[PDB]
Amino acid sequence: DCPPDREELGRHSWAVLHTLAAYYPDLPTPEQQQDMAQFIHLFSKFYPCEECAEDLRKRLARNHPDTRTRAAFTQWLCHLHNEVNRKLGKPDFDCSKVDERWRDGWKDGSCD
Amino acid sequence: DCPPDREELGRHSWAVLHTLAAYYPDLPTPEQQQDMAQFIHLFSKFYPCEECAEDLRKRLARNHPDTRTRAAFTQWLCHLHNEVNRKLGKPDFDCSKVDERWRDGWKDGSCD
Ligand SMILES: Cc1cc2nc3c(=O)[nH]c(=O)nc-3n(C[C@H](O)[C@H](O)[C@H](O)COP(=O)(O)OP(=O)(O)OC[C@H]3O[C@@H](n4cnc5c(N)ncnc54)[C@H](O)[C@@H]3O)c2cc1C
Ligand SMILES: Cc1cc2nc3c(=O)[nH]c(=O)nc-3n(C[C@H](O)[C@H](O)[C@H](O)COP(=O)(O)OP(=O)(O)OC[C@H]3O[C@@H](n4cnc5c(N)ncnc54)[C@H](O)[C@@H]3O)c2cc1C
Ligand code: NA
Ligand code: NA
Ligand SMILES: [Zn+2]
Ligand SMILES: [Zn+2]
Ligand SMILES: [Zn+2]
Ligand SMILES: [Zn+2]
Ligand SMILES: [Zn+2]
Ligand SMILES: [Zn+2]
Ligand SMILES: [Zn+2]
Ligand SMILES: [Zn+2]
């Protein structure tokens, strides 16, 4: 029960972000589309890893969140995460698997 | 690497929320105060535990986030969490300890 470090906070943050994405509507209202884009922007203002937050705001200044549908947003966010992975020398996550990882469980049923 | 369940997602969500609070400014601008209140409201719209999110929106409809300073917000959020703890038959967290838990580490140095 110590304050989470960069690694622990980062993992939990992605878990939160990818989970919210995984359950976002397939057919969001215009308000939901605006709200979710604003949510990601606000996260970028307050994420307390200052280097991380700066990096993120830079990225979002060009690459605005795609919140048009669940499919779009889950893909958008998976790609954003892979950009961070690449910076940190981590492998790309296969974005075609984003639903298995964050909603449905692996196809082999190992999460059932 | 399975989709987090209610318990795992909840723990990580509180970790994220209390950490953002712990590092929020002592002297936030009016824009930061509005932004952080909006951030909490948006979280309440998208948190995918539907019972949880409903519960939260109900609470926030009366008890709006206090984002006036770091001290206020960390306390506000600790109290909000304790309301949820109480519903779930968990003990109250001592809010006077919120900085030890989420920023500084325990006074005994066990986190150093
Ligand atoms: C917006 C943001 C920005 C950050 N910027 C920085 C930074 O600039 N510098 C820095 O050092 N750290 C940064 N971090 C923290 C960093 O990205 C990691 O969270 C941290 O290094 C821990 O890495 P990890 O290997 O445990 O797994 P993480 O990258 O935390 O991934 C957690 C899990 O998510 C899954 N996953 C991995 N990639 C993807 C993907 N593309 N899509 C969907 N799921 C995936 C995997 O199952 C993985 O185990 C940032 C975090 C966030 C949320
Ligand atoms: C906004 C929100 C709402 C939720 N609503 C529900 C709900 O209606 N029903 C439901 O079943 N679950 C709900 N959850 C999930 C639930 O609150 C817990 O996260 C989950 O049951 C796991 O509990 P836990 O005992 O692991 O610790 P959590 O309550 O997840 O706490 C994690 C850690 O935070 C620290 N902590 C505990 N209390 C406080 C506090 N008051 N202030 C600061 N730090 C604290 C402790 O170190 C604790 O180990 C909600 C979560 C959130 C974020
Ligand atoms: Na660590
Ligand atoms: Na569990
Ligand atoms: Zn690292
Ligand atoms: Zn943790
Ligand atoms: Zn699109
Ligand atoms: Zn790219
Ligand atoms: Zn529970
Ligand atoms: Zn986890
Ligand atoms: Zn106040
Ligand atoms: Zn109360």
Side-chain angles (χ1 to χ4, degrees):
Chain A
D1 300 343
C2 302
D5 60 28
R6 191 139 147 161
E7 311 296 337
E8 181 181 4
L9 173 67
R11 286 184 66 75
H12 295 353
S13 294
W14 288 120
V16 168
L17 295 178
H18 292 298
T19 303
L20 265 62
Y23 285 104
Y24 178 72
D26 287 307
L27 288 169
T29 65
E31 178 175 10
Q32 289 172 326
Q33 300 168 41
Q34 293 166 32
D35 277 2
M36 179 58 81
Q38 180 68 174
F39 178 76
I40 297 294
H41 284 294
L42 291 175
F43 189 81
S44 84
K45 293 195 181 181
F46 295 121
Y47 192 54
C49 172
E50 297 193 279
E51 168 185 8
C52 305
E54 290 166 34
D55 187 88
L56 178 64
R57 293 191 295 270
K58 271 31 133 214
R59 291 190 202 278
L60 303 177
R62 213 184 130 163
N63 175 26
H64 296 267
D66 185 348
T67 56
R68 184 154 184 200
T69 64
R70 194 193 83 83
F73 185 44
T74 51
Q75 290 299 309
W76 178 85
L77 185 60
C78 180
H79 175 81
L80 177 68
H81 194 164
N82 277 156
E83 289 286 356
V84 176
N85 286 343
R86 289 159 193 175
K87 177 190 173 175
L88 298 173
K90 295 178 191 288
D92 263 15
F93 181 85
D94 179 359
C95 295
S96 75
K97 310 278 186 72
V98 74
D99 278 342
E100 295 177 51
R101 171 62 186 95
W102 298 112
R103 194 184 65 175
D104 301 317
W106 304 109
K107 283 186 174 310
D108 68 356
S110 50
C111 292
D112 292 66
Chain B
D1 300 343
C2 302
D5 60 28
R6 191 139 147 161
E7 311 296 337
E8 181 181 4
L9 173 67
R11 286 184 66 75
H12 295 353
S13 294
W14 288 120
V16 168
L17 295 178
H18 292 298
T19 303
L20 265 62
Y23 285 104
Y24 178 72
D26 287 307
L27 288 169
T29 65
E31 178 175 10
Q32 289 172 326
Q33 300 168 41
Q34 293 166 32
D35 277 2
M36 179 58 81
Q38 180 68 174
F39 178 76
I40 297 294
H41 284 294
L42 291 175
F43 189 81
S44 84
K45 293 195 181 181
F46 295 121
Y47 192 54
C49 172
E50 297 193 279
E51 168 185 8
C52 305
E54 290 166 34
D55 187 88
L56 178 64
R57 293 191 295 270
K58 271 31 133 214
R59 291 190 202 278
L60 303 177
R62 213 184 130 163
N63 175 26
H64 296 267
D66 185 348
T67 56
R68 184 154 184 200
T69 64
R70 194 193 83 83
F73 185 44
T74 51
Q75 290 299 309
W76 178 85
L77 185 60
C78 180
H79 175 81
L80 177 68
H81 194 164
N82 277 156
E83 289 286 356
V84 176
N85 286 343
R86 289 159 193 175
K87 177 190 173 175
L88 298 173
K90 295 178 191 288
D92 263 15
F93 181 85
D94 179 359
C95 295
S96 75
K97 310 278 186 72
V98 74
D99 278 342
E100 295 177 51
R101 171 62 186 95
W102 298 112
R103 194 184 65 175
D104 301 317
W106 304 109
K107 283 186 174 310
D108 68 356
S110 50
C111 292
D112 292 66

